[PDB]
Amino acid sequence: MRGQKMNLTFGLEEVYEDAEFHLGDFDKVGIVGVNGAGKTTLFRLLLRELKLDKGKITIGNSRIGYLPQEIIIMDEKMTVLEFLAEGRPIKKMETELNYIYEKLTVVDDDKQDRLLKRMGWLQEQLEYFDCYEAESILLDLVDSMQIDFDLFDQPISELSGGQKSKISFAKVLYSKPEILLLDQPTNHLDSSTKEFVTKYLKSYRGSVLIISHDIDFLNQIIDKIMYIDKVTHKI
Amino acid sequence: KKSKKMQEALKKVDATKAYSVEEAVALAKDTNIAKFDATVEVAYKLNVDPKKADQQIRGAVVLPNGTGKTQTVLVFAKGEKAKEAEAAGADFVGDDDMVAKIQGGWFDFDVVVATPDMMATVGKLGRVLGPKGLMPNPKTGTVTMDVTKAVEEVKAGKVTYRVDKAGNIHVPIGKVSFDNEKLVENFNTINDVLLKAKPSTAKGQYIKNISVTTTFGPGIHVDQAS
Amino acid sequence: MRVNITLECTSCKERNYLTNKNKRNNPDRLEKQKYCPRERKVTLHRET
RNA sequence: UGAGUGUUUGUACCACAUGUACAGGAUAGGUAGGAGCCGAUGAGACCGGAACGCUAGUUUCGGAGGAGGCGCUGGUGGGA
Ligand SMILES: Nc1ncnc2c1ncn2[C@@H]1O[C@H](COP(=O)(O)OP(=O)(O)OP(=O)(O)O)[C@@H](O)[C@H]1O
Ligand SMILES: [Mg+2]
Ligand SMILES: [Zn+2]
């Protein structure tokens, strides 16, 4: 992860001004800054959701596990299992793959080449995200934070703030990512739940960037601390 | 720790020296002390990393000398495609209803091939095939407009190669019954298909190590140029 | 704060017009319907 | 502008050890081969010591004894 001459200005109030940063691999980086400093904005640049007005932001090709600061509930009626299942692209590809089979029957000798290639990738991609996860996720809840299965069938919007944070954190781990971008992973957690998160992040072998306002939580995990300045607009 | 037969085979083999193809095949034939028609397999450790979507490789290659073991063929067809399978003499010929019987019946068939239209109906059964790996795939050629080509290739000894997670791809070239020259020809066919399958994003040397081995014998490293 | 800006045709990405705007009064990127000489027709030009 | 010693280190071979989620008979790392495999060159069962351990068992060394087991097979599981 590297950024050069970073510039970003929403209207008249600027966020980054010629900012730069280089993060080595396998660094548990603790991102710190006052509210509005632009910590969440940095991840949006990494996720390519935002584009710098000027400068280059460089990200590795590895898959990124992103834990948003706010829970993303697309629909009120979504169940916890549906929310968690959306972490993996198994369902999305299967719906596409099912359609590919439909196209193959309709089209005889025109689009077969395109359809056959698309089918092959989906199967190979599906196997890469081994479809055995259906059982693993069910037991990932048990071993992660003692999340009861009664919640598993309950609408996500009805969960408590602490419960929602557990679900969102599990979803990130469920995706099996390569780089962890955690934006306040313990916002609502209680003392007991924080212990599990701390231990997992200590053990996590890969790179993990953590945006947190909990000094004690970071100190146990962080080896490198990145400070986003609000007045100098630098890193 | 090691059987005496394996020890003598190891002493025959030189770990330091990566033999040529001819010496390696002959040396493997010598090392398979076990008195059964063992199959000779070649393992390539490609530099490519499967975790990248493009890097992973999965295809099929026909061996002129074959694998030394006849392979049972299952075909899924309807109409003229069914007649093609019958003309090819496919071991098993079935349809959408017969897939359920194939589930739990006629099992142990070496390979499964389905027509492009049958794939949609076959897919339900294919999910079961998935873990077995029999499910036809377009890239391997199991899914073709003509099943006769697939059947004749299977009889000749077509082998499907798929890179493992660690980046090592294994394939049987033939039986110890086959002469060392025939085995070396099969190895060359395997080598050519792998080189043609080398992906674009790959870099550096394509193969980190090429090892030929019999079911009983240890590994023998083979010179890449040979 | 008033600054000069460039308006680029959203179709052909051609930097066609030069103008200026007060950032405070118009925080968001300006957009106008202006003639694009390359495409020789009116198109949406957005500030960059 | 060359010799050694020692220490802390990075790389690379070579030795070893570990692989416990659910179910599953149970400590299931992945892939390929796999009907045969191993053992008087000392097998099973047994006794102790040691290591692991998620405490369930796993691995290993030794003491005696002397010839047996394991696999395929079987259901489980996504995976035997
Ligand atoms: N589309 C936008 N339009 C206008 N202003 C914006 C926009 N996006 C961000 N800003 C401003 O950027 C500033 C910093 O961005 P950001 O939301 O990432 O801060 P933050 O450090 O993540 O906040 P916190 O740490 O409290 O969660 C915000 O104060 C916000 O007001
Ligand atoms: Mg924020
Ligand atoms: Zn234009």
Place of tokens 């007045």: A231
Identify the DSSP state of B19: B
Place of tokens 């080509």: B149
Interchain CB contact of A11 with C (< 8 Å):
yes
Q: Got the DSSP string for chain C?
A: -EEEEEEEETTT--EEEEEEEETTT--SPPEEEEEETTTTEEEEEEE-
The count of other CB atoms within 10 Å of the CB of residue B179 is 14
Distance CA B164, CA B159 (A): 15
B45 strand D contact, CB < 7 Å: no
The set of residues, in sequence order, having a beta carbon less than 8 Å from that of B221 and lying 6+ positions away, is B15, B17, B18, B19, B24, B209, B210, B211
**Structural contact between residues B23 and B178, judged by C-beta atoms closer than 8 angstroms:** no
Place of tokens 């000094």: A215
Distance from CA of B142 to the nearest CA of A (A): 12
Q: How many residues does chain C have?
A: 48
Distance CA B117, CA B147 (A): 12
Å between B19 CA and D61 C1'? 39
Q: Got the DSSP string for B126-149?
A: HHHHHHHT-S--TTTT-S-S-HHH
Experimental method: cryo-EM
Taking the C1' atom of every nucleotide in all shown strands and the CA of B168, the nearest one is D31
Report helix, strand or coil for A65.
strand
Considering only alpha carbons, which residue of chain B is nearest residue A123?
A: B137
Domain boundaries, chain C: 1-48
Any alpha helices (H) in A146-211, and if so which ranges?
149-152, 161-174, 191-203
**Structural contact between residues B161 and B169, judged by C-beta atoms closer than 8 angstroms:** yes
Half-sphere exposure in the Cβ direction for B37 (13 Å, CA): 8
Nearest partner of A57 among A49, A47, A44, A46, judged by Cα: A46
Q: Strand B73-76 vs strand B111-114: parallel, antiparallel, or unpaired? A: parallel
- Nearest CA owner, ligand 1 atom 6: A10
Q: Compute, in angstroms, the gap from residue A5 CA to the centroid of ligand 3.
A: 30
Å between B37 CA and D41 C1'? 26
Considering every ligand atom shown, identify the ligand nearest to the alpha carbon of residue A228 and give its number: 1
B38 strand D contact, CB < 7 Å: yes
Determine phi and psi for C33, rounding to 5 degrees: -100, 105
**Structural contact between residues A170 and A197, judged by C-beta atoms closer than 8 angstroms:** no
Considering only alpha carbons, which residue of chain A is nearest residue B137?
A: A120
Distance CA A126, CA B172 (A): 27
Note whether C1 contacts A11, CB cutoff 8 Å.
Answer: no
Å between A154 CA and D31 C1'? 40
- Tokens standing for A33? 């800054």
B103 strand D contact, CB < 7 Å: no
Interchain CB contact of C3 with A (< 8 Å):
no
Beta-bridge partners for A57? A3
What are the pocket residues of ligand 1 if the criterion is a CB atom closer than 6 Å to any ligand atom? A 10-11, 15, 33, 35-41, 69
**Amino acid letter, residue B53:** A
Q: Got the DSSP string for B40-87?
A: EEEEEEESS-TTSTTT--EEEE--TT--SS---EEEE--THHHHHHHH
**Structural contact between residues B34 and B216, judged by C-beta atoms closer than 8 angstroms:** yes
Cα–Cα distance list, C33 to C6, C16, C36 (Å): 14, 12, 9
Cα–Cα distance list, A177 to A69, A201, A223, B166 (Å): 18, 13, 20, 18
Distance CA B117, CA A115 (A): 12
Which strand (E) or helix (H) includes residue A143? helix A133-145
**Structural contact between residues B55 and B201, judged by C-beta atoms closer than 8 angstroms:** yes
Q: Compute, in angstroms, the gap from residue B165 CA to the centroid of ligand 1.
A: 42
